[PDB]
Amino acid sequence: STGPRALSRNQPQYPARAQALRIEGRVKVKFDVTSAGRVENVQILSAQPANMFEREVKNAMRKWRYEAGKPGSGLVVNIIFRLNGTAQIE
Numbered sequence: 467s468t469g470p471r472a473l474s475r476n477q478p479q480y481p482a483r484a485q486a487l488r489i490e491g492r493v494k495v496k497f498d499v500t501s502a503g504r505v506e507n508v509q510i511l512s513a514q515p516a517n518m519f520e521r522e523v524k525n526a527m528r529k530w531r532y533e534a535g536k537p538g539s540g541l542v543v544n545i546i547f548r549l550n551g552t553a554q555i556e
Contacts, residue, residue, distance in 0.1 A: 470499050470538050474531035477553040478545050479522035491519030491547030497527055499538035505530040511542075519547060 484491060493516075497508035508527045513520045523545050532538070546554040 470536045470541070471533040472530065473503060473533055474529070475555075476526055476529055477555055478519070478526045478547070480547065480551075480553070481522065484518065484547065485549065488549070489515065489518060489547075490549065491545060493519050493523055493545040495523055495527065495543060495545060497530075497538070497541055497543075499532040499536070499541065501535050501537050503532050503534045505532065519545060 478491075493513040494511045495508060496511050497505050500506055505527050508524055510516070510520055510523070544554055548554075
């Protein structure tokens with residue numbers, strides 16, 4: 467249980483508009499967790515396609531909430547969009 471620990475994190479928007487297109491959404495975003503447990507300094511590293519599953523990423527990060535006294539200062543969460551009907555969240 468080393469490092470930070472997500473307390474309040476929600477899955478990324480799963481718009482059917484993409485399902486029909488049959489496009490696997492996978493973006494690599496990097497944010498920095500503060501001692502307070504609030505996600506900030508969120509910036510997309512690589513998004514391809516970028517204009518497909520990027521606008522529905524920052525919206526989920528701004529809501530995320532990690533533990534306290536355990537900042538990340540540079541995390542990585544591949545925003546996968548498994549067609550199965552779920553996200554990278556195990």
